[PDB]
Every structure is written in C-alpha cells, then in structure tokens.
Ligand binder design. Structure first.
Ligand code: ICS
Ligand code: CLF
Ligand code: FE
Ligand code: FE
Lengths: 522, 477, 522
C-alpha cells in the first residue's frame, strides 16, 4: 500500500506492518533460521579475543580483502596518455568489472576494450583475438595509441604479447608505425598498483629504449613527474599548481585528470588531455625524474635509473608537513628555482590550522587501511598531529615497507601504541577494532560494514569510519578531494577534526542526559 | 629575576605611549615583592581604562548577565535593549546545568526586547510589559524573571523598577530589574556588584518569615562557583564525601529555590571573592552566617581547604575528611607521577580577570611549574594583597594590561606557556608560544578537585608539548 | 575518581554513578523542580500547532534572534582596508564582544579599539574620549587610517562624530592629513550588514566625494567590486580568481581575507593586505562598480550612482548556476573581455555534478535562515537542484526582499510549498520545523539546539542541521569554504548530497532491522 502524496522506497516501505508480518511468516515457515539467542551468542563470540586468535591463525582463507588485481591499475595508467585506448588481452568479464569499478568511483565514463577470449582461445591461444581486436578497435574508436594489458587467463595460457603484436603488424592488421605498448600484468602477483607500475614501465620502454644515442640528460630543463596509481584528481591538480607557482618546468607522465573530469555540455568526449607521445619521447632529456609513490614504483625506478641515467631522488610521498617540505626542497635543488612566498604562506596557514585544531586531535586513536604509500603518508601526518595510529593495515604491503613504517613510528612518542599488519584483510581489522577499540577508522567504503558490526554491540563500542582512499562508493564527488601537499594536508585536517566534533555533538545531544556538554563553541 | 632588567623592560614599553597614557599606565605595572603586604603602595587598579589602547575588559552588562544571573537555570533573563548585546553573549560562557531547555531551563537562550528607533524615541515600558505577558504565556514553567538593562535603557528615560513591581504584583511572579548598563563602571566588576545588590534586594528576602525547612548542623552554601565545565559538581562531590550538606550553589547550575534557601545554612563557602563577596558580607551582617574562602585548584590547596572546612565542625567531620584525603591520595599521586616529569621547570605568564591567577598558581606549582608573571583585568586591591603573598619574588604584575604591553612583555620574557582570554588566544599561537584558554578551560575540564586536577595536568602536558610548536619555521629559512 | 591512563573530561565523567547520585540528591532535595511528567507535557505542548499560533502572535518578545547589531559589520568592513584600525566610539564591552565573536568564527586575531566611554561621559559627551583615544591609538598601533563606528550608547546621547574628529585634528591630537573616515551605525536600526554598508559608504565619501574635479569614468580600465558583509574567505578568493583568468581589470574594495588568514610562522602581524587608499581614490575612474550583495548595499549604491556617476548593473549575488552566468556575462559586456574556455569547463563540471547527484537531491525539503542575499542565492540554487525550500526565514529582511523571493519561488514549480518569513526568529523556526517537518535545516551554529529539540521528540522527528552561514562556532575551519560561483556551487552541492547520504546511512545501520538498505554503492 502506497499513498500517492508520500511514496516510500524500500526503506521505510518494508518497515510497514504487513511487510513485517510477511517476513516473519517466511522466516518462521521456510527459512529454518537459527534461534535468535544462538545468533546473538555467535556474534558475541566473534567479538571476543579467542576469536581474534582463530582469525589471525588462518593462512589461506581471505575474507573481505583490501586490494584489486593488476589490470585495473594497468587500465588506470593507460588512461593517462593522450588518445590512448586501454586494451586488456583476455576475457571480457575483466573489462566489464574494471569499467564498473571505475564508473562507480569516479562517476565518469571509462573506456576500455577486450578481445573477448573464450574456450577457443583457451585451447588454441588468442593470437587471432589480438589481431582482430587491434584492427577493430583502431577502425572503430580511432585512438592514437593502444596500450595492451593481460588478464589471468592470458598469463596461464602463456600467450605472449610481443609476438602477437608483431604478427599483427606484419600481416597488415595495423600499420607498422602505430604505437602498441604492452605489459604483462598477472593478477596472481601483487595488486593493482603493481599493474600500474608494469604498464608505465611498458610504455616508457616502448618509447625510450631504441633511441638513447641522442639523449642528453637535462637538455630540456624539465623534471619528470610519475604520479603512480592515483584516484584523487586534486592530487594531480595540486602537483601541477605547486610546480607552476615555482617556475619549474615539468612533465607529468600519465596524468588522467582530464579524461576523468570532462564537462557535461551536450557532447561526449571519449578522449581528453593526457600525456603526449612527444613528452614520453623527450622524457630522457629531463634533468631528473621524481616518483610520487616510490613504494609501488620499483620496476619503473629501475628502468629510469638504468636506461635514462637519471639520479632518481629518495623522496617519500609529499604528504603532511615534513615530506611536502622535503619534496619542495628537492625540486628546488634539482631545478635551481627558489621556493616562492606563496608556498611559504600556504605552509604557515597549514601550521596555523594545526595549532588551532591541536587540542581536539591530541591523543585520538585511528585504525587505517589503504595502499602502501598512502598509508605511510597518512601515518606520518597522524604522528605530526599528535594522534595515535593504533592499527595500521596494508593488504598489499611487503616486509621492507613494514620495516620503514615501523622505523617511522619509532621516531615519535605517538607510535608506542601502533602496530603494523601486512597481508591481513578487513576481517582481521574487524577483530582488531573489536578487541582493541580505536576512536575512528580511516579507509574506503568497505569499512562501512565494520562500523555496522560495532554498532550491533552497542553505541559505546561504535567506531565511525572516515572515507579517505579508494574506492569510495557511498558518497558523491569525494574523488575531487586533495590528499597531496599543504592543500591535501589541510583538507585531511578539516575532515578529521570535524569528524571528531560531529561525533562529540552526536554523543552529547540527549536532553537532560548528556546535553550539558552540548556546547555552542568548540 | 634581576629586578633592574624587569624595571628597564617596563620603562621601554612605557616610552612609545603619549605623556598622559604613559603616566597612567606607569602605576599599573609592578614587580612583586612578597614582603610587601599593602598593594596600594606599589600597584593600583580599578581605574578607568585609557581610550584607544585595545583593552580587554568587558562592561557591567557582561558582569551581571553573563556571569551572575546567567547561569540561574529556571529564571528567564531578558536582555532589555537592542539585539546585538544579548546575541554576542549567548552560550559564550559555558556553565553546566541539568535541565530541559525550553521547558524549565533557559540558560542557553537569548531573550531580548530587540529595540528599534521607535523604542529609543518613545521609551519601552509598554513593550516591557507586553514582553512579560508573552513570556508568561509561552514559557509557563519559568520560576522567575530577570531584566538586564543595556546602555540605551539607562540613557533614555526608562523606568523598569515600576514595571517589575506592577507585573510581579499582578502575576505573583518574581521579576527583578538589574541596572547593569554597560557604561556604568569600568569593567565587569561593577556588574558583579549590581547583580549581587539585585539578588539581595529582590530574591534573598522572599523566604525570611518561612521556617518549614529542616536544618542540619552541616549546612553549607557554595558562593561564587559557576560550574564552568562542571567545576561546581567536582567540588560538591568532595564536600558531600566530607559529610556536609550543600543546600545551594551560586550560581552555576543554580536555581531561585536554592538562592532563597541559602540564609538557612550554617556556613558560606565563597569560591570567588571578587564577584560574590558583597552578598556574603550582607549575609553575615544580617543572618549571622560566617563565610570563608577555599581553593580547590590543585591537590595541595584542595587538602588545605578541606582541612580548613573540617576545622569549623565536629570531630566526625574531621575524621571523614581525613578519610577522603586518604581515599583520593593515590589518584592524584599517580597523576603527579605521570605528568610532573614532562612539565617540571617550565615558566608561565597568566592574564585572567579575577581570582583565577592567584588560585591557579597552586595547581601549577604542584606540577613543578613556575608562574613568572601574573595579571588581573578587573580585580581590586585586596586581590593584589592576596596575590603578592601568593606570588614568587621578583615577578611581574600587571593591571588592565593592553595588547601592546602584553605582547612586548611576552616577547622579552619568553614564557613556555600563556594562560589568557580568547581575545589573546590566536595572537600568541602565531608566535609559536603554546596557549591555554583559562576563561573556558579550552572547552575541556572540569579543573577543580582531585577529579579536575588530572584533566588540568593532561591539558597542560598536551598544550606545552605538541608536534606543532616545533614546525613554525620553514626549514629553508 | 579518575584513572591515570584514561582521564575523563566533563563528558562522560559526570555520567559516573556517584555524580549521578549527587545530582539526583541535589535535585530532589533543594531544586524544588517541577515533576517530570509536567515537564514532558509542557515539552509536548510546545511542539503543537496551538503553540505555533501563540508563538506567531508575538509582538514584543524576541527569542533566539538570527542577526547582530550594526557596528559589527562596520568593524568587519574597516578590517578590509590596508593598515586600517577599526575604532568604535562608545563603551568597551561592545568591542570586547565584537572581538570575541570574530575570534570564535574565524579563529584568527581580530583587532579593534574603543574610547572606553563611561557614565561621566554620558552626561558630558565623548569629545575628550575621542581625542585621547585617537592620539593613543595612532601613537601605539601605528595605523595608516582609523575608521570610526558608533555604539548605540554614543548614538543615543547624540555624539557628533564629524565635529569631534575635526576638533581632535585642529587641537593637534592627530595630523590634519591623517585619514579618519567615520560612519553613524545605530545598533537599533537594521543589522550588521547595514553597518557594513554604512562604513563602506562613509569611507567612500571620505576619499572620493570632495575630489570630483579630475575623475573620468572608465579611465583606469578597471571594475570596482564591493563584496559586502562576507565571512567566507573562499568567496573573495573565487571572485578574484574568476576575474584574473578572464583578464578583466578589477579593484576589490574592502577585502579582509589576507588579515583573516595569516600564516603562523613565529611572528604576529596586526595588519596584512587590504585595499590601498590609492585604490579608493582611483575608484571613480573605473568603467563601473559591481555590488556582490545588492540587498544590503543600498546606500553604497545610492552614493555610487549619485557621486561617481556609475551605472550599477542590476545583478543578483553570483550564487548558483544562472546568476553566476549572468554575472560573468555582465562582466564580459562591461570589460569587453570574452569568457574563457576554463570558465566554460568549470560550468560544465558543475552541470555534470548536478546530473550525477540529481536523484538524491530531488524533492528534499530544506528550512534555511541567514542574511538576505545569501538566503536568496541559496533558494535559487535549491530550486535549480530540484529541492523544495519549505521554510525560508530572514530576520533582517524587508518587504521588498520578500516580494523578490516570492517572485523567484513562483518562477519555479518547486517553490509551491514555500513560505518566506521576515522579522521572525529561531523560536518561530523551531515551531515551523516541529509542525511542518522538513528533511534538513540549513543555517549557522544556533540551529544545533533546534536539532536537539527535535531529537527529544523522537528520532523519526529529528531534523539534521547543515552548517552554511555565519557564525559557525562548533566546527573548525569552515570559514575557508567558498559559496560564490561555480566552485561555491560545487562545494554546496557536495555538502548537501553527502549530508543526505550520511543521514540515510545512519537510518539503515540497524543489524537485521533496517540494514537491508545499507548499500555499499549509492
Ligand atoms: S566570576 Fe569572574 S573573566 Fe570570578 S567575571 Fe569572568 S568564571 Fe574570569 S577570571 Mo571569564 S572573576 Fe569567574 C571569571 Fe574570574 S567569566 Fe569567569 S573566566 S572566576
Ligand atoms: S557596552 Fe555592554 S555590550 Fe556594549 S551596547 Fe553597552 S551594555 Fe551592550 Fe549590545 S546593542 Fe550592540 S553590542 Fe553594543 S552596539 Fe548597542
Ligand atoms: Fe561525472
Ligand atoms: Fe587561525
């Protein structure tokens, strides 16, 4: 039953009495549900510490992971080059899932194609798929370049990309001068950031390996910027702005910020902006190359050091105060350009905000999960704010990264509580936030269920989630936020302090019970 | 340290000022000598502020409304006059109360007459009567009305006393007028005096002839505790652990009933001398109730004050007092053992309007912290008489300090911490000096008692030591 | 009783058993408090329609007003000029309140000076006070200009500002060439925006009315922008940014954003930025003058059209999409500069966000209170988004503004269930949201109590508050936000949509009760 003036969607239409009776009848009659007391007992058991020892013990079962597979990162990297079509060699379900994932995160069109490999290719390989797909995509969507990745099916088959593409060009499917860079991106190795690294190295090697003879380091007086797997457009924008305000010539390599943010003006643009092939070709002429996310750019670092002869600086992600200062210092030293007064004023404003918000931030406990570089930058910023990161989780982190993060936590009195977990999923984190309750979580949308679980134990055990990372699905336009730089640091500070204040306001809102602390001024 | 250097510092600050301003401001700056016991011989106070010097004190309206009358929960307080004055003071000072706002509690509201041109040129007594009737019909559970005058009320020829008398005779309601016009006096102190006179003249004598209240030989009334962040409750838990019975607290979380029942108590414990000494003197003169001063800032002062209270009662009170001190010794001992090593030997400079700079010193010295300079915006001479003996030798004392003077003082002295009003909070944070909001406990607290000393130490530690105060300087300059 | 390793502040220390028992003893013994049933019955009566009729029959009582007195806006306007000291003739409590208010909003140092007027002055005037104050302020804080505003007490006793300033100048208290503009700001007229208008008119008359001899309209090839009373620094930033990429010559009059955003580097700057006296003197030599908030810049418009001979356009506040378009087109027409492609792409991105967020925004009911121009721009944007502004409240509005807002509402099909209220306060809005429940409230921090009241009636009756306006005291660094232009529209849209989504997330977090609608993707 609906009233035409007040139409109700599933919530709260299914809270009506007739629907409640229907659901009760269904459950009682045909579901054979466990007794509610048994369910409550099992839930309370899952809360406890003996459950956490069982949950930690598992060496095979993964529950609610916090990572994706390599071709997702490969597609994201390929999207950052001008008039380039990402091309995934394998089955079409991969491409459908990648496009849906990025569509839900960015709320923008995502263009990617596959060669739709089937049982025929499972038995006889996928060379004909490669030839037909290359010709079809070049004829239909007219790209200037096609970047080829692989799914797990291609890697198990052992189909090789180089021979397939060379045979495609030799047999007249595509012109011999058409650029077709490729990379092998097995989904059973690493994660999506590894796929980004592999694709970037493949493209860079495609454009800058057979002509090193006339390349002179520093001839164009520019600095190469390699962002890595980045899902915040504000980070690209802030890097560009900080380098432009400093009078520093730069080349942002694989920047997708234009195609991932296109105006709605009555026409659809499949391509927009991107790194030009000329910039890729001229990259070895640069003074140096800086990697914004070193911990998932390793093969790229090896290629740039051993082929372009660039002395890549040892820099951390420009997150927080100290690391942004170090990044600006290294850029100034390399380019010979002094830091202007605008950046100094911005840093002073960040320090002003830190001193203004310090009293609320001091001693807050945070549980956080994300990609290695992002997690370590967030931990560093939390330490600089006086906050306590008590649970640090990185599903795609290694032991060297864990050692570096532990060393970072050792140099501050706010990391005594902190412990670092690698290879653990979000079920482990649910156990951690149950047995050792923090004040807040910092992560992607998948943490919204953990909050839910905590709320089931009671309001005094609820751990609110703060949405920073990838992917964010239940909020709108948060992908336009900036995490990098002084601007990113102040945005993160505002989010953290206002989340704390909102939680306090919610807790102290009960009339004549807790509203004595419902202060107008905070 | 080095009195001659401190004297040279004062004179250098004085030189920029014009001759009259310099001559006036000379007498408000002093160097503390603990042997000296008469403040008027070295430092002067309670004088008119010098114009155009960016002063810090408020008006009489602030001292009456936002300080004394404001925290009374079941009264409805009307800011009589233009809108802005009552708007700037709404919920700006936090006095904790237990009640339902809108029904029986009205502390965090702004009732105002909202004067316009026609009210200025034709008066506002008729609007006052209509406002009283509207308050009566819309808020039926209010147990009394207060009318706090603003500047144009006194400046135009308005008579609110007659309106109050007529309306209180008609509705059988307590309606008190307060002539707390801002231009009266030089600071919030005259507001305190006017509010106390109003309480004496309209509220205190309501239950004089009524003797249906059972009396106990352990009856005390708290005067001058405004429950800032829950201070009064923290003191009251200790008092009731001593076995006493608190009939009233003035005026934080206070009610008209406790104010009326106050004359029936055996002792008056006055926490704020400056704001509420007048009412206690009147009570002693009329009802013969002795009053004494106590200090719950810090474990040392708390223990001394508790023993002092117990010394005015029987042996059971002293025994139960000794028991409370033994019960709470380990907690504050652990607090000290945790936070003293991180605050020992640090120097502070505090500027708070009255009572608190002398009071807070015991809590600081307990944490091994030295106050190298202290001042009061509105305190009288007697406050300074207490301060001199409460202060260390060769320290700086200031009265009605201006922004320039305070700025230069902290620049030359370089204290490790400053405790002051919000008007100075961001000024001294931009210099890299850690700052603590003494007036509002920085939205934290309470600070009194063994329960508040832990919060005080924790807040001091976190402000004094922070990973922000070391990052003011960009590392490329 | 406090644990040393877990110390509790007022919340929730006062929820302990002994504190609860002590409070119960106090209430039962000495408070003589009304019985709880009586309190509940009175509360329930306050939420009904009969109470609404009684409360809307108010004629003399004002409860919880939504405006401030006149000199506050004058102080804010004076802060927008270079090395200018706001000086208020009257008593010092007014200045103390102004400084406290602005410190709590901006979390920045605010400098104001007072002559400390007293009852002895009330009977003899404040001429000597003015002389001594001017001399002391000039000798102490070394400003290049002192701007004079009047307290209600100075206005009642009829102090002549011009005569007192002239006598101070003549008797040697201040140099005769020292600029000392003055304005009469009676606090019993209008509100703070009227004070901003009065001070700006006074300063403009001080600098330009006498020198009409050498002024030619359109000489310097610049446009004058008067922002009015504005408490978002981002508004000044966005106005300056949009004109600069356009390349139109511009002159911002009275901007305080550099003073209200000062870096924390170890030194305190009493003055920073502003508009030079040369800019004020060169103001009449411009092609035109644009007023950003016409509905409280009225006397300024009269002065500009009478003395400057400028044809002030009939432009609304650049809030939303259509009004930003009109502002940009008018600036293009006046300055002869075309609208660049960057502005077009920003507008397209705003439209893209509108199309992506439209389904959640559509049909939502909003109650909004604030300054007239801000409220009307918010109403325009809400109608643009397909939202329903039900209760529109403006304490300091007038009949003409109400007619304009009624016309705007009638021009759209979403304003059918809309009522505009002028001269009403937040108790009226409390009654309105109790009897005609909207989905959300939009306003400043004073609405946080209204929400509390609604939550006391029931969770299903609670009306969440969205903090957009002045002042905001319980949230940190929200004054750095933007409201004007495409950027401000984007920020407001993000705030609205994400507030809706957090409310929906809260409503569906109940395990096995409402969590069937706890969607990961929204
Ligand atoms: S009443 Fe007075 S200015 Fe004694 S007007 Fe003021 S809540 Fe201060 S130094 Mo705000 S004489 Fe109380 C005071 Fe002290 S408002 Fe509070 S902190 S102890
Ligand atoms: S010294 Fe004190 S606070 Fe000042 S006015 Fe006077 S009583 Fe009041 Fe209220 S209304 Fe506004 S702020 Fe003043 S200018 Fe007229
Ligand atoms: Fe989109
Ligand atoms: Fe600040």
């Amino acid at each position: 039953s609906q009233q035409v003036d007040k139409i109700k969607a599933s919530y709260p239409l299914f809270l009506d009495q007739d629907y409640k009776d229907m659901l009760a009848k269904k459950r009682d009659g045909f579901e054979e549900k466990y007794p509610q007391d048994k369910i409550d007992e099992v839930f309370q058991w899952t809360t406890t510490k003996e459950y956490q020892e069982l949950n930690f013990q598992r060496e095979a079962l993964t529950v609610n992971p916090a990572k994706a597979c390599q071709p997702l990162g490969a597609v994201l990297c390929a999207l950052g080059f001008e008039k380039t079509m990402p091309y995934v060699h394998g089955s079409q379900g991969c491409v459908a899932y990648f496009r849906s994932y990025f569509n839900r995160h960015f709320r923008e069109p995502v263009s990617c194609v596959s060669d739709s490999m089937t049982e025929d290719a499972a038995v006889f390989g996928g060379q004909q798929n490669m030839k037909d797909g290359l010709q079809n995509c070049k004829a239909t969507y007219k790209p200037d370049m096609i970047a080829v990745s692989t799914t797990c099916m291609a890697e198990v088959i052992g189909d090789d990309l180089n021979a397939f593409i060379n045979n495609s060009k030799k047999e007249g499917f595509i012109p011999d001068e058409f650029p077709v860079p490729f990379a092998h991106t097995p989904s059973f190795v690493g994660s999506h950031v590894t796929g980004w690294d592999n694709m970037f190295e493949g493209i860079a090697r495609y454009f800058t390996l057979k002509s090193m003879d006339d390349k002179v380091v520093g001839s164009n007086k520019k600095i190469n910027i390699v962002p890595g797997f980045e899902t915040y457009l504000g980070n690209f924008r802030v890097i560009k702005r900080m380098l432009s305000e400093m009078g520093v010539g730069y080349s942002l390599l694989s920047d997708p910020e234009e195609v991932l943010d296109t105006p709605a003006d009555g026409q659809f643009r499949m391509y927009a902006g991107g790194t030009t092939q000329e910039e890729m070709k001229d990259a070895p002429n640069a003074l140096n190359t800086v990697l914004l996310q070193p911990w998932h750019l390793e093969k790229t670092k090896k290629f740039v050091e051993g082929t372009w002869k660039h002395e890549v600086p040892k820099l951390n992600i420009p997150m927080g105060l100290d690391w942004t200062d170090e990044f600006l210092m290294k850029v100034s030293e390399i380019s010979g350009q002094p830091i202007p007064a605008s950046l100094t004023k911005e840093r002073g404003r960040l320090v002003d905000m830190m001193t203004d918000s310090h009293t609320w931030l001091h001693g807050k406990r945070f549980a956080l999960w994300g990609d290695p570089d992002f997690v370590m930058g967030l931990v560093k910023f939390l330490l600089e704010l006086g906050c306590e990161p008590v649970h640090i989780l990185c599903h795609n982190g290694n032991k060297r990264w864990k050692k570096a993060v532990d060393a970072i936590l050792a140099a501050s009195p706010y990391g005594k509580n902190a412990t670092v977990y690698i290879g653990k999923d979000l079920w482990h984190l649910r156990s951690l936030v149950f047995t050792d309750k923090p004040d807040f979580m910092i992560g992607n949308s998948y943490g919204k269920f953990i909050q839910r679980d905590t709320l089931h134990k009671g309001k005094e055990f609820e751990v609110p989630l703060i949405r920073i990372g990838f992917p964010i699905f239940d909020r709108h336009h948060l992908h336009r936020s900036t995490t990098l730089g002084y601007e990113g640091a102040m945005q993160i500070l505002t989010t953290l302090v206002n989340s704390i204040l909102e939680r306090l306001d919610e807790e102290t809102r009960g009339m004549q019970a807790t509203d004595y602390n419902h202060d107008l001024v905070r | 340290m080095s009195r001659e250097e401190v004297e040279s510092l004062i004179q250098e600050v004085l030189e920029v000022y014009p001759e009259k301003a310099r001559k006036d401001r000379n007498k408000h700056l002093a160097v503390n000598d603990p042997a000296v016991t008469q403040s008027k011989k070295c430092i002067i106070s309670n004088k008119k502020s010098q114009p155009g010097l960016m002063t810090i004190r408020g008006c009489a309206y602030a001292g009456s409304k936002g300080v004394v009358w404001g925290p009374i929960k079941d009264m409805i307080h009307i800011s009589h006059g233009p809108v802005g004055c009552g708007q700037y003071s709404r919920a700006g000072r936090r006095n904790y109360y237990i009640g339902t706002t809108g029904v029986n509690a009205f502390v965090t509201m702004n009732f105002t007459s909202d004067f316009q041109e026609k009210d200025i040129v034709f008066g506002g007594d008729k609007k006052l009567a209509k406002l009283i009737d509207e308050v009566e019909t819309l808020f039926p559970l209010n147990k009394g009305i207060s009318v706090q005058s603003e500047c144009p009320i006194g400046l135009i020829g308005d008579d609110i006393e007659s309106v109050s008398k007529v309306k209180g005779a008609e509705l059988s309601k307590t309606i008190v007028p307060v002539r707390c016009e801002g231009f009266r006096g030089v600071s919030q102190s005259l507001g305190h005096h006017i509010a106390n006179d109003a309480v004496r003249d309209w509220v205190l004598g309501k239950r004089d002839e009524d003797t249906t209240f059972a009396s106990t030989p352990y009856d005390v009334a708290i005067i001058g505790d405004y429950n800032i962040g829950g201070d009064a409750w923290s003191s009251r838990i200790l008092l009731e652990e001593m076995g006493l019975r608190c009939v009233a607290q003035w005026s934080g979380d206070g009610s008209i009933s406790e104010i009326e029942l106050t004359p029936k108590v055996k002792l008056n414990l006055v926490h704020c001398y400056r704001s509420m000494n007048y009412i206690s003197r009147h009570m002693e003169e009329k009802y013969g109730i002795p009053w004494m001063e106590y200090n719950f800032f810090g474990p040392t002062k708390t223990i001394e004050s508790l023993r002092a209270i117990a010394a005015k009662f029987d042996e059971s009170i002293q025994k139960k007092c000794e028991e409370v001190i033994a019960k709470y010794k380990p907690e504050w001992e652990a607090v000290v053992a945790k936070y003293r090593p991180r605050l020992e030997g640090k120097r502070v400079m505090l500027y708070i309007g009255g009572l608190r700079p002398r009071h807070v010193i015991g809590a600081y010295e307990d944490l091994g912290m030295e106050v190298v300079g202290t001042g009061y915006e509105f305190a009288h001479n007697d406050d300074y008489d207490r301060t001199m003996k409460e202060m260390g030798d060769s320290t700086l004392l200031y009265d009605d300090v201006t922004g320039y003077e305070f700025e230069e003082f902290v620049k030359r002295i370089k204290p490790d911490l400053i405790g002051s009003g919000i008007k100075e909070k961001f000024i001294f944070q931009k210099m890299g000096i850690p700052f603590r909001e003494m007036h509002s406990w920085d939205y934290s607290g309470p600070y009194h008692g063994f329960d508040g000393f832990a919060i005080f130490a924790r807040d001091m530690d976190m402000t004094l030591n922070n990973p922000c105060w070391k990052k003011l300087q960009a590392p490329w300059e």
